[PDB]
Paper text:
GK catalyses the rate-limiting step of glycerol utilization, with phosphorylation serving to sequester the sugar in the cell. The 501-residue GK polypeptide is arranged as two domains separated by a deep cleft. Each domain is constructed around a βββαβαβα core that is characteristic of the sugar kinase/Hsp70/actin superfamily of proteins. In agreement with gel filtration experiments (data not shown), PfGK is a dimer in the crystal.
The PfGK–ADP crystals have different cell parameters and it is apparent that domains I and II have moved apart and that the enzyme is in an ‘open’ conformation. The relative domain movement can be described as a 27.5° rotation, substantially larger than the 7° rotation deduced from crystal structures of orthologous enzymes. In the dimer, the long axis increases in length from 97 Å to 117 Å, exposing a further 1500 Å2 of solvent accessible surface area around the active site. In the open (ADP-bound) structure, interdomain contacts such as Gln12-Thr268 and the salt-bridges Arg83-Glu306 and Glu109-Arg363 are ruptured. Aspects of the glycerol pocket are maintained, with a pair of ethylene glycol (cryoprotectant) molecules clearly mimicking protein interactions formed by glycerol. However, as a result of domain movement, Phe271 and Tyr135 are significantly displaced. In contrast to glycerol, which binds predominantly to domain I, ADP in the PfGK–ADP complex is bound exclusively to domain II. ADP is bound with the adenine base tucked into a pocket and the ribose and phosphate moieties more exposed on the enzyme surface extending towards the interdomain cleft. The adenine base forms polar interactions with Asn418 and Ser332. The rather modest set of polar interactions with the ribose and phosphate groups involving Thr268, Gly313, Gly414 and Met415 are likely to be augmented in the ternary closed complex with ATP.
Residue numbers in the entry:
A (entry chain A): -4 to 501
B (entry chain B): -5 to 501
Amino acid sequence: SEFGSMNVILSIDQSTQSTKVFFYDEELNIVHSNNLNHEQKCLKPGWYEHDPIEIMTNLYNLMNEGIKVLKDKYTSVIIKCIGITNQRETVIIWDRITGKPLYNAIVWLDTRVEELVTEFSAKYNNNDIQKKTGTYFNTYFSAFKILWLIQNNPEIKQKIDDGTAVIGNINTWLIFNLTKGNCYTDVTNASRTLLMDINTLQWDEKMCKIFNITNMSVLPEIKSNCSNFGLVKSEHVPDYLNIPITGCIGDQQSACIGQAIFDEGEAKCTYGTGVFLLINTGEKVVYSTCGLITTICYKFNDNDKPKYALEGSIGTAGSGVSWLLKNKLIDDPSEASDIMEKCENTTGVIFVPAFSGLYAPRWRSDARASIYGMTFNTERSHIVRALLEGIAFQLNEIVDSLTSDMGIEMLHVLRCDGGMTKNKPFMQFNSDIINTKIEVSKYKEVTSLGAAVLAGLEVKIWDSLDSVKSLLRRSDAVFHSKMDDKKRKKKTSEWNKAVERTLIQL
Amino acid sequence: ISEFGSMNVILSIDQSTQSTKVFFYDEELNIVHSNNLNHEQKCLKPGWYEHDPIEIMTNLYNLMNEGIKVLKDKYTSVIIKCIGITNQRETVIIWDRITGKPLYNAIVWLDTRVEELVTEFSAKYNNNDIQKKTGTYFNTYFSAFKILWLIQNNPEIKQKIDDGTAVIGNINTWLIFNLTKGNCYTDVTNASRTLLMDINTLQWDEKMCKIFNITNMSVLPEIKSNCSNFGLVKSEHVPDYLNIPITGCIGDQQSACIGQAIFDEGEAKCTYGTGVFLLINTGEKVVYSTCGLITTICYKFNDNDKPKYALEGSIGTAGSGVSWLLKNKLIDDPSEASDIMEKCENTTGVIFVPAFSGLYAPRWRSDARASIYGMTFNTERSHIVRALLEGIAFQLNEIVDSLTSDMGIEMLHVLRCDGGMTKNKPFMQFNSDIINTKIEVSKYKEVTSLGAAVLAGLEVKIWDSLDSVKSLLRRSDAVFHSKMDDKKRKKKTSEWNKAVERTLIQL
Ligand SMILES: Nc1ncnc2c1ncn2[C@@H]1O[C@H](COP(=O)(O)OP(=O)(O)O)[C@@H](O)[C@H]1O
Ligand SMILES: Nc1ncnc2c1ncn2[C@@H]1O[C@H](COP(=O)(O)OP(=O)(O)O)[C@@H](O)[C@H]1O
């Protein structure tokens, strides 16, 4: 119909929970979006799988309905290019010629490989693994899952050996189906497999040896984030025939592009159910001394030195707000904002909210949630505030660890997203204790945003990264530290003591 | 009007902190009638706590006169045979011996204006010699530091003590003085709560009075035994009571031991109310505590009798931990606490050291705070509520294990329990397990007025022997025996010990 010309960028965000499509214009407004859940298959405990075909069929459905919606509004709809971003680590093995999965996707959240990680960790110098791949052995990354498949599945062992299978992360799987055969990954995804030399950006021989990948040609070419990943040829999305796929990045790194985290000492934190952090380390490979992850932030082109990052997680810290709600200590999450406005301090109350142990730098799985310093005067308010403060303290320990390893004194910025960022009193406390400028982005959808940006740069939609930079840096709330260093030292040491009581062996 | 025949009764007066109660017991110890009246709890500035001695007296006369009218409007021949007095202890009044005017309000045991003096006097004296003399260290609760404060900030009180025309009395003395229009008496149990009595010889102490500026020892009432003739009622305020004998007198906590039939060594009572505190009968042995608990007099029936002794321990306002769960929405009603301990068999590793006001005896750590340990995302209101309740039991067990170690015994004969936490049977059962004791909950709520009726009736020979009353008094309404093996007790109390360690370790 009637409304004229419309040039768009398709950004696909294939998430854990669902599949999203965003149609961006070249000013980076969302002209249209939709999404579709897929089933989160948890068979026995610790298992977590996806139907790779369900995901693909959801994707086609979304692509086809989006373009009809756009074409029913505008006169000349042009989809210029396609950006792909995705749940990392999650792995599929399939048949190179029919494209049938030889098994479901095994999601990053899956832990059936826990016993193997223990075994292989007892046998190998985890220190040499960290130098090679940027991380110790773990249950999240793809390799131990690829291994489990090789060990409990004769067909997968055999078609890996004969060279007629493909081992792919979700991006590879998306691009292979859309282009009817192309076998690619990018640097950021490749870095989440346990198979890639973190220094040379190549599939690693010794790592594959460790993991029984006997034939290295089943692994897709590692491309850079901007690159030609092929043309759409699928007959499932007829309107998209011959449209170029031109950006590809893992979700967490995509959100760094959406948050314009481009230079060293620039960092982004998500405060959702999970609370985790990425610090851009410039062109320097920094290895952590406290067990945090060395990753690839991005590499735009083949000529570029890649930019590196450091990664840290405090698990599902935002679920401590759900736990206050279960125990009636608040009635609505919004009440947490209210409480931290009214309540200036906790009157000496400290909450070490280690419900699942303490993560980096301490690494203590045996730590539990502990509240200290209460009197008859203590109220829901004080306990709720302490919990929230306990989240900030954990986060500060990670920042103080990563910044110590990087040889810097302070973060340039911490760009923040997720639902806890609606709490401004809480944002302010994080700024105080960490000693950092905190900016909350203008955009919710920083993850799809980064893939659109990458895809648009590759086809030269904008004339330079600087053109997009100032668009991307728009903040919606800004925070500077209002706490003196003497008071920071005093509080974080009261925290340290409370963590000591929590951990001392008796 | 009044046609239901003959009625012989014992009057029991319970002059409490909060109010004044009258109980008319028959000689089967049924309550034929009771009534009561609040008096004002005066908290001027912080730490201060006073009563109007006249308001109390006037409440008492009002209750006495309305009770007897009620009885006389029902019965044909009402006979009030004797009167028993029990009372809030430690609370002190100084008055004029001849007019009976108070020279100042009563200063309630709960009052702490004397805190600086206790600190001073404690820096100066061997608190160890004080304990041997009086059964306790210096404190803000007992009468002497309040009598002292009065002497120091009040020239009239200093002067009329010096010249011999004033009386220093606990609430019993005050009651008996006004009722009999002049008699000046106390009993052994009240005397023991003044800081002025030799805990061994039952005499007012010279040296202790020296310490406290009681320059003239004749202002102190004669120490009587618990059964004794305290005088006849002569007051014209209660005309119907003229010439009725006052024949029992005891401090409230010791009266409850009499009502709970706590007569032999190794027999103990615990109250689980807002406050949670314990008394263990030590037989005829004066046992001094090695952990700062109080050596007191349980009772002495007659002048010929060797007194029976007790040990006393308090965990402060532990029952208020249940109010704190309610403020923080962790339960909706105290009754939900019983429900929770039925359903919830354990706390899945969760421990609550409920030290809201610090830890009392044996540890004595004012710097301890309330602390909760061992939680995961799976922890629920139930687990925290049960942990708190279990934390109360563990504190109590430390006190029992202290007192029993000083007494040279291995186990309590019984623990007779009262208060509203005793409606929670799963909680009573856990205390029985951890402390390792038989727990009996009495048939009677009103064990405090019960004891004074018993004492008054024995004095006038209403019953033929203490054994006559004993079996009546020992009626229980619930009984608990330990269902926990000693290996599990050792494992739990040692997990508790470690949690108290984390709470207290200095960093
Ligand atoms: N006003 C608030 N104050 C503190 N925490 C909040 C507030 N609102 C939401 N949260 C927490 O934020 C998380 C939800 O944020 P979101 O980013 O949508 O989660 P997810 O990462 O699961 O998508 C939950 O942990 C929730 O309890
Ligand atoms: N079912 C119960 N479980 C646990 N505690 C209870 C229960 N019912 C009442 N309580 C507590 O008992 C105390 C009240 O008992 P009571 O002996 O009447 O108090 P007080 O000593 O103030 O007169 C309060 O601490 C109250 O919260």
